[PDB]
Design brief:
Chains A, D, F: One of its GO terms (cellular component) is plasma membrane-derived thylakoid membrane. Chains A, D, F: Light-harvesting photosynthetic bile pigment-protein from the phycobiliprotein complex (phycobilisome, PBS). Phycocyanin is the major phycobiliprotein in the PBS rod. The complex is a heterohexamer, with three copies of chain A (about 160 residues) and three copies of chain B (about 170 residues). Chain A is mainly alpha-helical and about 160 residues long. Chain A has one domain. Chain A is built from eight helices and no strands. In chain A, helix 1 runs antiparallel to helix 2. Chain B has about 170 residues and is mostly helical. Classes of the chains: A mainly alpha (about 160), B mainly alpha (about 170). At the B-D interface, helix 4 of B face helix 8 of D. Bound molecules: the ligand *[C@@H](C)[C@H]1C(Cc2[nH]c(Cc3[nH]c(/C=C4\NC(=O)C(CC)=C4C)c(C)c3CCC(=O)O)c(CCC(=O)O)c2C)=NC(=O)[C@@H]1C (9 copies). The site of one copy of the ligand *[C@H](C)[C@H]1C(Cc2[nH]c(Cc3[nH]c(/C=C4\NC(=O)C(CC)=C4C)c(C)c3CCC(=O)O)c(CCC(=O)O)c2C)=NC(=O)[C@@H]1C has 20 residues of chain A, from helix 4, helix 5 and helix 7.
Chain lengths: ~160, ~170, ~170, ~160, ~170, ~160
């Protein structure tokens, strides 16, 4: 799983070399950034149900055809409305996981790998999730570098859907 | 490969769960102590050649059969192969110290090691001694109260000793 | 012989420097852990006989070859030798704790000791074992939370670990 | 050449990936460590001549034969004194460079690559250069994390020689 | 590949020189400006997808001959490649921004590209237009004064336009 | 180096015994007295340049021939005045060192051993340094037990000079 630490290790191992100062600097930078990172993760987690419930309604409001058009892939149903909310919480959870790990790893392994395959196969549209992520950005309440940290990973998810 | 943070991430994912405050605190206290983990890796790595070479000299002093003609460590090719294993194991242990998790040592170094030695007739007992000697040297160097801000490195040192004992168990 | 304060002073003289305002603050902190340091020395010393004898008993139970006739600790003369060494190492460890510095242990006890045992036929490995057992007993005793004003001695115990770690490293 | 910044880029380039937050943390760690690093580098550059002379005398002293044995490989002539002092300066210049780069890259490229081959061909003993670096470590005057920075790249050379 | 520090070191070694205070000071000054450099990479990178798509759209609207049947960007395979090329150039520009040196961009992206286009039939003048669009968008995003501590990034924005115009020059 | 702690250890080691309560009590006295002696070492350190320049001037005013008699051992030249100021700061620095160590050790090792050979060889008169020490005692402005501590180590050097 890609983190600043496993990447520093991976680099030494690929060259058959003990860790060097080169790498210890990387991890220190991770440790010092971690203060901002876990703040943001804490704040997003403590207020996840609001962010989730509000990001779902946000998608419905922008693509209201997703609330009425017939089909499995739509939040036309109770089951559909529940799926959509489930998916959105997944993206939120993964954002917090990246903040804890200080890297994209968790999102890469658990969500982005296979993302295009799943959306094409189940006729889910990326712009749906893009709007939910926009909403999370706009309403996490974060300030300072805690906010920069959160939005880095939210924009990564968005890039990935684009 | 997991570091300590990714290990907790992965356990929570298998449950579908955000982290708890117990978990936040845990990891965040790990970060708070991070300078000590950097000193430990810096200290062992910066002395690796000494750790390997003295441990090896000690081992063959204790078990002279290893370097008698016919010994598993006799001839220069087998001696250098022995020393190489000593560096590799030390390498993967320091990787694990940096990560805060056994997984890199376990995946890329220990798995299949015992079967490897059982295959070449290398005495895994004696590899274990070599690993315990490197352990004592590394812990002394990393835990050396000279030349560093004084504080409590005790949880960390138990972790480091953990990784070394884990290697020793794995090769015999 | 240096103690903690004498060491800061000798490092500063080699530079021709007065001490910093930061250094003085650091030294106030040493002074403040005074009582705990004395507790630890009092506690280890007051139980030294137990620490040594329990460690030696445990060693000979794990490594009976040492007391088999022909063994390195067979004959009362050699056994007494062995216990004397254990006693000596602990004494010098306790001195380092009083000093707040390893130099008295390193200079009067550790320097040359590996070569001594190698020359005697005494297995330094086993000695390192006796030192680790004394280590775990000493720290448990010094950090026993009963019968003392409650507080946090973790750094002090980290430092004490360090002196035993040197010891055990030094004998193989 | 290996620095925390090139490792970061190389990591992402090898996955054909844009840089992520994983990598920027590594660079910030380097940027913050550069304060100790750049300070160690300046100090040794200022005191260079005396560390070099002190270092050669330290070597000639622990290995008295290096000054009595005849042989173009020995400091037993004025030519061998000048070769040896030149070499010791090279080691010191290499520590300074590693401090400036925040990594081992310069020493790796310019001195450690082929080091064994040279010391063998020309009958130069590694123990000599190791004593020299021990002297530099012991006499640079640094305190705090600047010292930590200098001794890491000094001990890295010592390891290379061992 | 070099970064700004390694380039100075490589210059100095070619002369056998320690660094001058000039160079020490210059590189130290790059470090105290480093926060802005990180803001700029993160900002450009977090908007990579829209920098590229908006620029491509804008190129084809000014140059519809590229997407007429027969044109270089006609068919999805060729459209994908052109878009890919845009991503690749932007990414290496951002490598160069992080490094403070164009060498990664030169060696790994720009060298031989002009000839590759001449070979394939791709109008390098149009690639340079696409590159100049990504530059305008990227700088405006990097140098947005909202949601960031106020300050002057003018020196850096000039450096960044540096790397885009270099790239555009190399294909045109 | 003599301090109350190394004396305590040196007592028990000479007799081949563990430390006893006899020695723990003495170390405790040293910890207790440290409040006053480190206050003294800090204050002298902070005020060191003015104390040194003032001491030198006291010496010249008391023994003006030191500034006119021709000879390398006198302060009659820019260089003799630097030598003298240097020596006086050595003295002050060793007093601060005794205070930090809680004992005469630093001054014993670094200054008093050989003292009179050096003064004789280099024709430096002890009375010059005694007046500088008197000046420092009279002008450090410390009060209470911090005064008692500073004065103990100053009068110790004065004794050594007498
Ligand atoms: C147990 C390992 C022993 C310690 C460790 C200890 N260190 C510190 C402070 C400390 N260590 C560093 C080291 C680094 N920072 C980096 O970025 C890197 C990689 C290049 C390294 C190697 C720093 C910067 C600091 C803080 C500055 C200082 O010198 O204090 C402490 C103090 C507490 C803390 O900061 O966590 C401790 C306890 N001390 C012992 O007594 C153990 C034997
Ligand atoms: C870790 C070692 C455990 C502690 C230690 C602890 N002690 C104290 C206070 C304390 N200890 C002494 C002991 C001595 N003073 C001397 O001069 C001598 C030599 C004969 C000794 C043995 C004293 C006098 C005091 C102060 C009065 C008191 O009894 O409290 C504390 C309190 C804080 C402090 O002074 O630093 C602590 C925390 N307690 C634990 O729980 C650790 C396991
Ligand atoms: C032009 C680029 C715009 C600037 C930039 C600017 N930023 C800062 C401070 C600053 N930027 C960061 C960003 C990071 N640090 C990291 O480690 C990482 C990677 C994870 C990033 C993305 C930080 C932490 C800080 C310090 C805290 C703060 O927010 O202030 C400044 C202030 C000066 C300085 O720190 O150098 C400026 C001026 N501001 C503008 O108005 C330009 C449009
Ligand atoms: C909500 C924004 C819009 C949706 C939601 C919706 N999704 C699905 C099915 C669905 N969603 C996923 C996504 C993930 N699976 C994972 O494991 C991960 C990472 C951990 C993610 C992000 C998958 C794989 C699937 C298919 C398999 C499954 O059912 O779990 C549906 C139902 C699809 C169907 O039944 O055909 C819906 C409705 N649709 C909308 O209209 C909302 C706007
Ligand atoms: C020294 C303490 C003891 C030895 C060691 C020894 N090993 C070998 C061969 C050997 N060792 C390994 C170990 C590893 N390969 C890996 O990739 C990893 C992790 C990345 C490890 C830990 C292997 C695979 C092999 C076989 C290949 C080879 O020899 O190059 C030998 C020589 C075997 C022989 O010549 O028959 C020795 C001597 N022997 C002792 O006696 C010491 C106790
Ligand atoms: C006990 C756990 C292990 C022993 C120990 C053992 N040692 C010796 C002899 C011995 N030990 C020392 C060590 C020191 N002398 C000092 O002055 C100091 C510091 C003050 C130290 C650390 C010496 C010098 C000697 C030689 C002197 C002597 O023999 O009396 C023996 C006996 C050797 C013999 O008589 O042949 C033993 C048995 N033996 C084990 O089996 C245990 C692992
Ligand atoms: C000094 C501690 C001891 C020596 C020094 C010595 N060296 C040589 C020849 C010599 N040294 C090098 C080293 C380097 N060349 C590089 O480019 C680098 C990296 C930048 C290094 C470290 C080389 C390649 C050579 C041979 C080629 C040359 O002459 O430059 C000599 C003379 C050897 C000879 O002429 O036969 C000596 C004396 N010898 C001692 O006794 C000192 C202890
Ligand atoms: C888009 C704005 C313009 C194009 C672009 C276009 N390019 C190609 C093929 C093409 N481009 C490259 C460039 C690189 N390959 C690398 O690996 C790197 C960095 C490491 C670079 C900079 C190559 C090598 C190739 C050939 C390989 C391939 O096509 O897979 C095409 C394809 C033309 C074709 O298939 O016939 C296109 C369309 N065309 C335009 O009209 C735009 C101006
Ligand atoms: C100032 C009160 C009067 C002087 C001072 C003076 N001293 C010297 C030479 C000198 N001073 C020392 C003293 C020390 N060296 C040490 O290492 C220590 C302890 C840290 C001390 C106190 C020495 C050894 C020497 C001789 C070697 C040297 O030059 O350093 C001189 C010049 C002597 C000469 O070259 O003839 C002077 C002028 N003279 C006055 O008239 C002042 C009143």
């Amino acid at each position: 799983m890609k983190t600043p630490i496993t990447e520093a290790i991976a680099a030494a191992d690929t060259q058959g070399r003990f860790l060097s100062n080169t790498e210890l600097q990387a991890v220190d930078g991770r440790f010092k950034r971690a203060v901002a990172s876990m703040e943001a993760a804490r704040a997003l987690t403590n207020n996840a149900q609001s962010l989730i419930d509000g990001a779902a309604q946000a998608v419905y409001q922008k693509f209201p055809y997703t609330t009425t058009m017939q089909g499995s892939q739509y939040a036309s149903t109770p089951e559909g409305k529940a799926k959509c909310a489930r998916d959105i919480g997944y993206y939120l959870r993964m954002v917090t996981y990246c903040l804890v790990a200080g890297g994209t790893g968790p999102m890469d392994e658990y969500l982005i790998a296979g993302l295009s395959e799943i959306n094409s196969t189940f006729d889910l549209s990326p712009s749906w999730y893009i709007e939910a992520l926009k909403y999370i950005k706009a309403n996490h309440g974060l300030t300072g570098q805690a906010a920069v940290e959160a939005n880095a990973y939210i924009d990564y998810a968005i890039n990935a859907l684009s | 490969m997991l570091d300590a943070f990714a290990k907790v991430v992965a356990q929570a994912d298998a449950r579908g769960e955000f982290l708890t405050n117990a978990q936040f605190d845990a990891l965040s206290n790990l970060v708070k102590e991070g300078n000590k983990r950097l000193d430990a890796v810096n200290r062992i790595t910066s002395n690796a050649s000494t750790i390997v070479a003295n441990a090896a000299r000690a081992l063959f002093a204790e078990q002279p059969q290893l370097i008698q003609p016919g010994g598993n460590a006799y001839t220069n090719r087998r001696m250098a192969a022995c020393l190489r294993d000593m560096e590799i194991i030390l390498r993967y242990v320091t990787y694990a110290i940096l990560a805060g998790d056994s997984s890199v040592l376990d995946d890329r170094c220990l798995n299949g090691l015992r079967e490897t030695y059982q295959a070449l007739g290398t005495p895994g007992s004696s590899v274990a001694v070599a690993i315990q000697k490197m352990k004592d040297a590394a812990i002394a160097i990393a835990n050396d109260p000279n030349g560093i801000t004084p504080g409590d490195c005790s949880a960390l040192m138990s972790e480091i000793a953990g990784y070394f004992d884990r290697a020793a168990a794995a090769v015999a």
